Coordinates of all heavy atoms in Angstrom, one line a residue:
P1 N 90.3 116.0 134.6 CA 90.1 117.1 133.7 C 91.2 118.1 133.8 O 91.8 118.4 134.8 CB 88.8 117.7 134.2 CG 88.1 116.6 134.8 CD 89.2 115.8 135.5
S2 N 91.6 118.6 132.6 CA 92.8 119.5 132.5 C 94.1 118.8 133.1 O 95.0 119.4 133.5 CB 92.6 120.8 133.1 OG 91.9 121.7 132.2
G3 N 94.1 117.4 133.1 CA 95.3 116.7 133.2 C 96.1 116.9 132.0 O 95.6 117.4 130.9
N4 N 97.4 116.6 132.0 CA 98.3 116.7 130.8 C 98.8 115.4 130.3 O 98.6 114.3 131.0 CB 99.5 117.6 131.2 CG 100.1 118.3 130.0 OD1 99.7 118.1 128.9 ND2 101.1 119.2 130.3
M5 N 99.3 115.4 129.1 CA 99.9 114.2 128.4 C 101.3 114.5 128.0 O 101.5 115.5 127.3 CB 99.1 113.7 127.2 CG 97.6 113.4 127.4 SD 97.3 111.8 128.0 CE 97.4 110.8 126.5
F6 N 102.3 113.6 128.4 CA 103.7 113.8 128.0 C 104.1 112.5 127.3 O 104.4 111.5 128.0 CB 104.6 114.0 129.3 CG 104.9 115.4 129.5 CD1 104.1 116.5 129.2 CD2 106.1 115.7 130.1 CE1 104.4 117.8 129.5 CE2 106.5 117.1 130.4 CZ 105.6 118.1 130.1
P7 N 104.2 112.5 126.0 CA 104.1 113.6 125.1 C 102.6 114.1 124.8 O 101.7 113.3 125.0 CB 104.7 113.1 123.7 CG 104.4 111.6 123.8 CD 104.5 111.2 125.3
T8 N 102.5 115.4 124.4 CA 101.2 116.0 124.2 C 100.7 115.9 122.8 O 99.5 115.7 122.6 CB 101.3 117.5 124.6 OG1 102.1 117.6 125.8 CG2 99.9 118.1 124.9
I9 N 101.6 116.0 121.8 CA 101.2 115.9 120.4 C 102.3 115.2 119.7 O 103.4 115.0 120.2 CB 101.0 117.3 119.8 CG1 102.3 118.1 119.7 CG2 99.9 118.2 120.6 CD1 102.4 118.9 118.5
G10 N 101.9 114.6 118.5 CA 102.8 113.9 117.7 C 102.6 114.3 116.2 O 101.5 114.3 115.8
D11 N 103.7 114.7 115.5 CA 103.7 115.1 114.1 C 104.4 114.0 113.3 O 105.6 113.7 113.6 CB 104.5 116.4 113.9 CG 103.8 117.6 114.6 OD1 102.6 117.6 114.8 OD2 104.6 118.6 114.9
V12 N 103.7 113.5 112.4 CA 104.3 112.6 111.3 C 104.6 113.5 110.1 O 103.8 114.3 109.7 CB 103.3 111.5 110.9 CG1 104.1 110.5 109.9 CG2 102.9 110.8 112.1
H13 N 105.8 113.4 109.6 CA 106.2 114.0 108.3 C 106.3 113.0 107.2 O 106.9 111.9 107.4 CB 107.5 114.8 108.5 CG 107.3 116.0 109.4 ND1 107.2 117.2 109.0 CD2 107.3 116.0 110.8 CE1 107.0 118.1 110.0 NE2 107.1 117.4 111.1
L14 N 105.8 113.3 106.0 CA 106.0 112.5 104.8 C 106.5 113.5 103.7 O 106.1 114.6 103.6 CB 104.7 112.0 104.3 CG 103.7 111.2 105.2 CD1 102.9 112.2 106.1 CD2 102.7 110.5 104.3
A15 N 107.5 112.9 103.0 CA 108.1 113.7 101.9 C 108.5 112.7 100.7 O 109.0 111.6 101.0 CB 109.3 114.5 102.3
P16 N 108.3 113.1 99.5 CA 108.8 112.2 98.4 C 110.3 112.2 98.3 O 110.9 113.2 98.5 CB 108.1 112.9 97.2 CG 108.1 114.3 97.5 CD 107.6 114.3 99.0
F17 N 110.8 111.1 97.9 CA 112.3 111.0 97.7 C 112.6 110.3 96.4 O 111.8 109.6 95.8 CB 112.9 110.2 98.9 CG 112.6 108.7 98.9 CD1 113.4 107.8 98.2 CD2 111.5 108.3 99.6 CE1 113.1 106.4 98.2 CE2 111.1 106.9 99.6 CZ 111.9 106.0 98.9
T18 N 113.9 110.6 95.9 CA 114.5 109.8 94.8 C 115.7 109.1 95.4 O 116.5 109.7 96.0 CB 114.8 110.8 93.7 OG1 115.2 110.0 92.6 CG2 115.8 111.8 94.0
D19 N 115.8 107.8 95.1 CA 116.9 107.0 95.6 C 117.0 105.8 94.6 O 116.5 104.7 94.9 CB 116.8 106.6 97.0 CG 118.1 106.0 97.6 OD1 119.0 105.7 96.8 OD2 118.2 106.0 98.8
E20 N 117.6 106.0 93.5 CA 117.7 105.0 92.5 C 118.4 103.7 93.0 O 117.9 102.6 92.7 CB 118.3 105.5 91.2 CG 118.3 104.6 90.0 CD 116.9 104.4 89.4 OE1 116.1 105.4 89.3 OE2 116.5 103.2 89.2
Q21 N 119.4 103.9 93.8 CA 120.2 102.8 94.2 C 119.4 102.0 95.3 O 119.6 100.7 95.3 CB 121.5 103.2 94.8 CG 122.5 103.8 93.8 CD 123.7 104.4 94.4 OE1 123.6 105.4 95.1 NE2 124.8 103.8 94.2
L22 N 118.6 102.6 96.1 CA 117.7 101.8 97.0 C 116.7 101.1 96.2 O 116.5 99.9 96.5 CB 117.0 102.7 98.0 CG 116.1 102.0 99.0 CD1 116.9 101.0 99.8 CD2 115.3 103.0 99.9
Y23 N 116.1 101.7 95.2 CA 115.1 101.0 94.4 C 115.7 99.8 93.7 O 115.1 98.7 93.7 CB 114.6 102.0 93.3 CG 113.5 101.4 92.4 CD1 112.2 101.5 92.7 CD2 113.9 100.7 91.3 CE1 111.2 101.0 91.9 CE2 113.0 100.1 90.5 CZ 111.6 100.3 90.8 OH 110.7 99.7 90.0
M24 N 116.9 99.9 93.2 CA 117.5 98.8 92.4 C 117.9 97.7 93.3 O 117.9 96.5 92.8 CB 118.7 99.4 91.6 CG 118.3 100.4 90.5 SD 119.6 101.0 89.3 CE 121.0 101.1 90.5
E25 N 118.3 97.9 94.5 CA 118.5 96.9 95.6 C 117.4 95.9 95.6 O 117.7 94.7 95.8 CB 118.6 97.6 97.0 CG 119.8 97.4 97.8 CD 119.8 98.1 99.1 OE1 119.1 97.7 100.1 OE2 120.5 99.1 99.3
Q26 N 116.2 96.3 95.3 CA 115.0 95.4 95.3 C 115.1 94.4 94.2 O 114.9 93.2 94.5 CB 113.7 96.2 95.2 CG 113.4 97.2 96.3 CD 114.0 96.9 97.6 OE1 113.7 95.9 98.2 NE2 114.9 97.8 98.1
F27 N 115.2 94.8 93.0 CA 115.2 93.9 91.9 C 116.5 93.0 91.9 O 116.5 91.9 91.4 CB 115.1 94.6 90.6 CG 113.7 95.1 90.3 CD1 113.4 96.4 90.8 CD2 112.8 94.3 89.7 CE1 112.1 96.8 90.6 CE2 111.5 94.8 89.5 CZ 111.1 96.0 90.0
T28 N 117.6 93.6 92.4 CA 118.8 92.7 92.6 C 118.4 91.5 93.5 O 118.7 90.4 93.1 CB 119.8 93.6 93.3 OG1 120.1 94.7 92.5 CG2 121.1 92.8 93.6
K29 N 117.7 91.8 94.6 CA 117.3 90.6 95.4 C 116.3 89.8 94.8 O 116.4 88.5 94.9 CB 116.9 91.2 96.8 CG 117.9 91.9 97.5 CD 117.6 92.0 99.0 CE 116.6 93.1 99.4 NZ 117.0 93.7 100.7

């Protein structure tokens, strides 16, 4: 009880992006 954790917390971040050349890489393949 009241032991600790290393790491203690974890934050995931998500954000929208635009990358037309990455997208087009797909249909190329």
